[PDB]
Design a protein around this ligand. Structure first.
Ligand code: CA
Lengths: 204, 152, 51, 55, 102, 101, 51
């Protein structure tokens, strides 16, 4: 090659020209590589729970309900390329894969995870009158990725693309007010759900 | 609420169909406006097409099956640590799964003006939109047939 | 109870399975939290920054 | 039949003619680095090409 | 026939490409807080020593004493949800019963 | 870039044997008995709106002889307007000569 | 192997897909479900020492 390097292919003249460049190319991209930022992402979960220094009874149930703590986290994934969902859970794991480590150890309850990607039309099983979900079930159906939040906790994608995966995207796709807080999902609170059994017992 | 703050779109496993700029450059006279240089990142683009990364789709038959396995009471995957909290339950699987998969791509970029002398060793470079080396690049054979035009 | 006889509990398990039923060994190792069975994936993806 | 006065141009002023300056420095930043561990200032060498896209 | 020249290849003629991107890094910043991807704008001047804006001014100069045109090929992708409202795969009319008595 | 793919719904008969074994009701089948009001049969073949990306050549066109460093592009929808389901759209175009003055 | 005191235990080279470690937990520093949760992720090669 070297020696060759020197020598010259000599396209000529007294008239310049050009060429038609066709080209073949192949690649192996894992849907979730980090290089394409189908790897990271930000969001904040609960990390602490207590009550100001005295443990129980009158507020024994209510005490638990008096001090919460939040923090922003950049958690990542295991490069690869996965099924629509797969991806989800991975985060919906690694999101947990954070909690576990800090939630348990600081009075945080799985109850208050606060950030759970997921597909489903919570509200479909609604009813007008009860203003609830009559079948005591967010009728288990896939509709389209969705992110559920608790208060204070949120999710920022700014530094990632998975967003485009979650088929959810900013409407002015060229800035950054892009993070999602309990606060923004207005009205979109889950309905709550209803009690089946009880409804039944007292059916007579 | 957000229907304005954002918009509902479909699921892209490619999650970001990106383009990439092809640029060999000790051959082509460099298109208009590019400055000549030898800083791998710039490199005057000869042609560009997007990633050989597209998406295929299939119908997940494992649709209902799971509804009847955790209903028969059995082991838990790190995926469904909350087989009861309606809320925390390994989201339903969709009817349709999607899979990032790359194919190879054969493309014509057009015809270009090239210097009138080529060093036995042309160097080629595929740049990614944020102009850089993409290493998921497999094998890439470019061929090009010069041809005449104009005259002095 | 194998857990109320030792406070006088929750210990029960630190014991990382050692070998499978057919008695094939898992060459666990010391420390008991790491079987000397190394795997491409993990290393790359899960553990070694840049080394 | 196709003969031409086809002229793609734009800003980047015509590599111009008629006289220009030639700056001959010696303590321009890259030069040092790459060429003058050598010796002093009695002689050294210097890139005259003032383009920064070049070692 | 005094000709000072050197590398920086003669602003060349006979045909070249024109790259028309929209997510080139500076562009966004400076011009597309505006809107989306249905329209936006982009510097076509590929020189990095220029803020889109300034560039904006300067001119790519296709020449003359003979006009011409170009071959515009083009790439485009979209995410349309079969039932968006914008395509009216959302609404519809029909009438039902709403009262009964004697 | 919105076309349709199709597949064979295997969940064809399965349902015939689940509401026949007597079980829970989806907001979809509130009338598991009124032949009439029953969550219509599913078809043998399901269809899915899915968009692909499209690469197209539009031809060659006459262009002004001077372009401002900033060309603005715009994809209009039949009722000529902005379509925002538009992802990324890279158009490139190679001028070329023709005619003469 | 058989013929030379080698144990299946110490096979030492087994290609395979799976995310050993997924079923992990921080605290035990182990795999709580007593199972390298049987899931395909992407080919992988597991090794023993020396092999
Ligand atoms: Ca099938």
């Amino acid at each position: 090659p070297t020696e060759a390097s020197t020598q010259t292919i000599n396209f000529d003249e007294r008239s310049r020209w050009g060429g038609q460049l066709k080209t073949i190319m192949h690649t192996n991209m894992p849907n979730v590589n980090e290089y394409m930022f189908s790897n990271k992402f930000k969001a904040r979960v609960m990390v602490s729970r207590k009550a100001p220094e005295g443990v129980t009874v009158n507020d024994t149930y209510d005490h638990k309900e008096d001090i919460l703590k939040y923090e922003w986290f950049e958690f990542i994934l295991p490069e690869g390329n996965f099924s629509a969902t797969m991806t989800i859970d991975l985060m919906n794991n690694a999101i947990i894969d954070n909690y576990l480590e800090i939630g348990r150890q600081n009075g945080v309850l799985e109850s208050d995870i606060g950030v759970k990607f997921d597909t489903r039309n919570f509200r479909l099983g609604w009813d007008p009158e009860t203003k609830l979900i009559m079948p005591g079930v967010y009728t288990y159906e896939a509709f389209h990725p969705d992110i559920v939040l608790l208060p204070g906790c949120g999710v920022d994608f700014t530094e990632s693309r998975l967003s485009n995966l979650l088929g959810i995207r900013k409407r002015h796709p060229f800035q950054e007010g892009f993070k999602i807080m309990y606060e923004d999902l207005e009205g979109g609170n889950i309905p709550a759900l209803l009690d089946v059994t009880a409804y039944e017992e007292s059916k007579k | 609420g957000i229907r304005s703050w954002t918009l509902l779109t479909t699921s892209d496993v490619t999650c970001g169909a990106e383009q990439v700029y092809w640029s060999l450059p000790d051959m082509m006279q460099d298109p208009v406006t590019f400055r000549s240089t030898r800083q791998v990142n710039n490199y005057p683009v000869v042609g560009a097409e997007l990633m050989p990364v597209f998406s295929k789709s299939f119908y997940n038959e494992q649709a209902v099956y799971s509804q009847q396995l955790r209903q028969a009471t059995s082991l838990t995957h790190v995926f469904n640590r909350f087989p009861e909290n309606q809320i925390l339950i390994r989201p339903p699987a969709p009817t349709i799964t999607t899979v990032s998969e790359n194919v190879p791509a054969l493309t014509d970029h057009g015809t270009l003006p090239l210097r009138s002398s080529i060093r036995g060793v042309q160097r080629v470079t595929v740049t990614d939109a944020r102009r850089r080396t993409c290493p998921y690049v497999y094998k890439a054979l470019g061929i090009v047939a010069p041809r005449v035009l104009s005259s002095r | 109870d194998t857990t109320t006889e030792t406070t006088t509990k929750k210990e029960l398990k630190i014991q990382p399975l050692e070998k499978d039923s057919k008695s094939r060994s898992y060459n666990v190792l010391e420390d008991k939290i790491n079987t000397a069975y190394r795997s491409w994936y993990l290393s790359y993806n899960y553990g070694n920054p840049e080394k | 039949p196709t003969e031409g006065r086809n002229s793609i141009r734009y800003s980047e002023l015509s590599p111009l003619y008629d006289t220009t300056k030639l700056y001959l420095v010696d303590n321009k930043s890259a030069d040092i680095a790459s060429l003058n561990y050598q010796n002093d200032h009695s002689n050294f060498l210097t890139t005259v090409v003032q383009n920064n896209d070049f070692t | 026939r005094n000709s000072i020249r050197y590398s920086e290849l003669s602003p060349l003629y006979d045909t070249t490409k024109l790259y028309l991107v929209d997510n080139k890094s500076a562009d966004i910043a400076s011009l597309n807080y505006q809107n989306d991807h249905s329209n936006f704008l982009t510097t076509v001047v590929q020189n990095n020593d220029f803020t889109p804006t300034e560039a904006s001014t300067q001119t790519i100069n296709f020449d003359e004493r003979s006009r011409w045109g170009g071959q515009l090929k083009t790439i485009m992708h979209t995410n349309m949800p079969n039932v968006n409202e914008y395509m009216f795969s959302n609404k519809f009319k029909a009438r039902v019963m709403v009262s009964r008595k004697a």
